[PDB]
Structure 1
Amino acid sequence: RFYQMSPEERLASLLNEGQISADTKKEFENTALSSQIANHMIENQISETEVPMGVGLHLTVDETDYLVPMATEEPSVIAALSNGAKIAQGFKTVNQQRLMRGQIVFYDVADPESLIDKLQVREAEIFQQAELSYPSIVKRGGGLRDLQYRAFDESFVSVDFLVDVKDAMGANIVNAMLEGVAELFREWFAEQKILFSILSNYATESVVTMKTAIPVSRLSKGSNGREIAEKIVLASRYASLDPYRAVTHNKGIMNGIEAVVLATGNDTRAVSASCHAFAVKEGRYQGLTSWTLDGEQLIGEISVPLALATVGGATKVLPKSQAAADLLAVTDAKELSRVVAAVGLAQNLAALRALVSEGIQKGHMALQARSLAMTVGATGKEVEAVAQQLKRQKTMNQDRALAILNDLR
């Protein structure tokens, strides 16, 4: 059976059955992550996806400078982060919490108030069972912190667990705790029915809020920085009115956030789900940032749930995660979340400035022009000279870039 075959046997079988070509088999064999690691981490393993990784520059958070590992396939994301970080100069923490959530959900509950009374008088025993079900997190100074109770639909009761999982994302800790407590619940309440017991990825107790305050002159190379700031404010407010913009606005933010999450070995689906769900405010999907003009400064703020990890999951077992974490110089998960939120705000700034100025299309083209200048051998003032001239005609390629460079030499 395929599940029980070695990776080599799996690839040989796919080729034999005509499901992949010999060239595809050879490419699937071209890997850099150890086969033993890859085949351990997932099931039915055959190969890997390689996502380019680069370095985001100029980010400063609470007066500490960072070099940001960013894994993405999308052109201009990393250059845009670097551009936004450089404009903003620095980011400051406004607020931060870090707890992870789980739930045990009962169903067919005749009297939710009565069930809640029986749970609430037993909270000390629940906390003791939570520790017994995962003792190591308590030893390390974390563990269950709070129990909350919600009733739904005259049938359901959610017992909400708020847990300090220290530097892990917390799925294994929380799920082990919940399974152990659910076993005790089944002993105590043999006639109540538990539907499921599972983590929640909606990590509303891991929200971090970061801000920046930018002199408006930094928003343009000319004298119209205030008029750019006013337009950034309008574009950000427009995301609160039109979900077709809000989705794209937040997608841009996530181009930066997801790139760091992926590079550091964190779970990209969990961050995406928590951030996009948090975008729903007052019943409408809206932007995750706010931009306002205060005096002669453009003020930006982001607020996102970032239950990120510096240990566990794929943060250590994948060697590239460890390499990215060395570059980023962060071992504390609270700090990781502050940095990642700042990346999202810097990314959004670069996007909004471009959108309301030359446009993102022209912004991409300017990056392409500079790349072409560098590829054909321009150095120093030559790079900006070739790139600026490339921008004056619509067709750009290496032949034209070299002709410009050689004409200038």
Structure 2
Amino acid sequence: ADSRLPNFRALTPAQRRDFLADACGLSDAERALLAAPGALPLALADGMIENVFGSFELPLGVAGNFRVNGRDVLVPMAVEEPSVVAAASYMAKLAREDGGFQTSSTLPLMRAQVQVLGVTDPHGARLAVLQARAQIIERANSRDKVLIGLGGGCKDIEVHVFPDTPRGPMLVVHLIVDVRDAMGANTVNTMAESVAPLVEKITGGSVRLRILSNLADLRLARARVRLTPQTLATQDRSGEEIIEGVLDAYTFAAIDPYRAATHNKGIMNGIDPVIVATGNDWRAVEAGAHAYASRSGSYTSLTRWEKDAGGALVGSIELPMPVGLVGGATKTHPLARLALKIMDLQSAQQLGEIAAAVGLAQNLGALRALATEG
């Protein structure tokens, strides 16, 4: 596995495709899928969304040089904006000098909210629900033996109480569900529906919404990169000076929401195209990322940029990453399946980690460029 892309700026799209096909060991059928338009026939698209009358193409590029937890990975990106793919590739190249990106993940835990109205003693009812947690978990897991056998399923519950609202008290049960390699929305929505009668019995209330939370802060991807001054040095600027410029740009985003919005937008320039190319739901990843960015009480940067004790630049990111390898468009779209093969993905967690590293690299590309522009 080798993600270096020698001379890709000079190759034609056909030559880039043949190189990738060779590098990833794509079959002759998969190579054909890419060499002609229409990999998603309208008959397939017609079953994906409603009122289909055609298809809409995004350019599909590949970012090179990425290395994550010691393994090279080629990264397909479906996006319309110039500079994005080249900046990701270049920052990944610089990151190779320290051995690449280092990533980790929490378990793939999604929240399902069960909203209960009509309970006049919600704090006491919360204790009753928590006392019955084992029964509620068993009820949540009773319909999905396949997920259970994989090691997934509902693992825990939380209860949150909003005692004073314009609509009366609300008690909200969260089912915490390990969804393995799925995005998980339909799985956790169904579990929420399954536990509603039991929650109504325990609380005496009336269940209304039964729905996942897109603030997927129990399903986090993490990525870290370190670049020495010599790695960052250019003909015109020392690496030391570039590092100080990156730190000035980062602190600006940390203290000013007007800058943080642009700073985080740059991150999603890297993340969203990977999400789109793998057939995943880019609205869910956007909502989770930007909502997480405001968890402190102010909308701020999703990344951190620092200097370690020896003076090297260190970047880090932590953000919700609800993505899947199965289900939805990732199953039906022939090119989405091809994207997973190009990336050689083993789990949704791994896809989330690679995406977080691409977002971190994209952020660096923007900060480094903005700080070295004359």
Q: TM-score, normalised by structure 1?
A: 0.77
Name the CA distance, whole Å, in 1 between partners of 2:156 and 2:202. 21
Q: Which of structures 1 and 2 has the larger relative contact order (alpha carbons within 8 angstroms, sep 6+)?
A: 2
Match 1:277 to one of 291, 305, 310:
291
| Structure-to-structure mapping, 1:343-382, within 5 angstroms | 343-358=358-373
Report what 1:159 is aligned to. Answer: 173
Report what 2:92 is aligned to. Answer: 85
Structure 1: 5+ residue runs without aligned partners? 1-29, 360-409
Name the CA distance, whole Å, in 1 between partners of 2:163 and 2:287. 25
Alignment of 1:331 onto 2:349? no
How far residue 119 of structure 1 moved from its aligned partner, in angstroms, is 1.7
How far residue 95 of structure 1 moved from its aligned partner, in angstroms, is 5.3
Match 1:215 to one of 218, 228, 242:
228
Report what 1:36 is aligned to. Answer: 43
How far residue 189 of structure 1 moved from its aligned partner, in angstroms, is 4.9
Report what 1:11 is aligned to. Answer: none
Report what 2:12 is aligned to. Answer: none
Question: 1:141-164, CA deviations, whole angstroms, 9 ceiling, x for partnerless residues?
Answer: 210011111101330111011100
Alignment of 1:53 onto 2:55? no
How far residue 107 of structure 1 moved from its aligned partner, in angstroms, is 1.8
How far residue 126 of structure 1 moved from its aligned partner, in angstroms, is 1.2
Q: In structure 2, the residue corresponding to 1:311 is in which secondary structure?
A: coil
Name the CA distance, whole Å, in 1 between partners of 2:203 and 2:105. 43
Q: In structure 1, the residue corresponding to 2:331 is in which secondary structure?
A: coil
Question: 1:314-355, CA deviations, whole angstroms, 9 ceiling, x for partnerless residues?
Answer: 111100101111111113111111111000011111111100
Name the CA distance, whole Å, in 2 between partners of 1:157 and 1:279. 26
Contact kept in structure 1, 2:114 and 2:210, CA below 8 Å: yes
Q: 1:293 to 1:185 in 2, by over 3 A?
A: closer
Name the CA distance, whole Å, in 2 between partners of 1:264 and 1:310. 8
| Structure-to-structure mapping, 1:269-308, within 5 angstroms | 269-294=283-308, 295-308=310-323
Contact kept in structure 1, 2:112 and 2:174, CA below 8 Å: yes
Q: 1:283 to 1:190 in 2, by over 3 A?
A: closer
Superposition RMSD in Å = 1.6
Report what 2:23 is aligned to. Answer: none
How far residue 118 of structure 1 moved from its aligned partner, in angstroms, is 2.5
Contact kept in structure 2, 1:94 and 1:211, CA below 8 Å: no
Name the CA distance, whole Å, in 1 between partners of 2:304 and 2:70. 22
Name the CA distance, whole Å, in 2 between partners of 1:149 and 1:277. 21
Q: In structure 1, the residue corresponding to 2:61 is in which secondary structure?
A: strand
Letter in 2 for 1:34: P
Bigger proportion of residues as helix = 1
Q: 1:55 to 1:112 in 2, by over 3 A?
A: same
Name the CA distance, whole Å, in 1 between partners of 2:221 and 2:45. 33
Name the CA distance, whole Å, in 1 between partners of 2:68 and 2:146. 32
Question: 1:91-131, CA deviations, whole angstroms, 9 ceiling, x for partnerless residues?
Answer: 11255342111110112320012212332232222122112
Contact kept in structure 1, 2:129 and 2:203, CA below 8 Å: no
Alignment of 1:104 onto 2:114? yes
Alignment of 1:121 onto 2:136? no
Contact kept in structure 1, 2:229 and 2:311, CA below 8 Å: yes
Report what 1:144 is aligned to. Answer: 154
Q: Percent identity?
A: 43
Name the CA distance, whole Å, in 1 between partners of 2:41 and 2:186. 24
For the pair shown, the structure with the greater C-alpha radius of gyration is 1
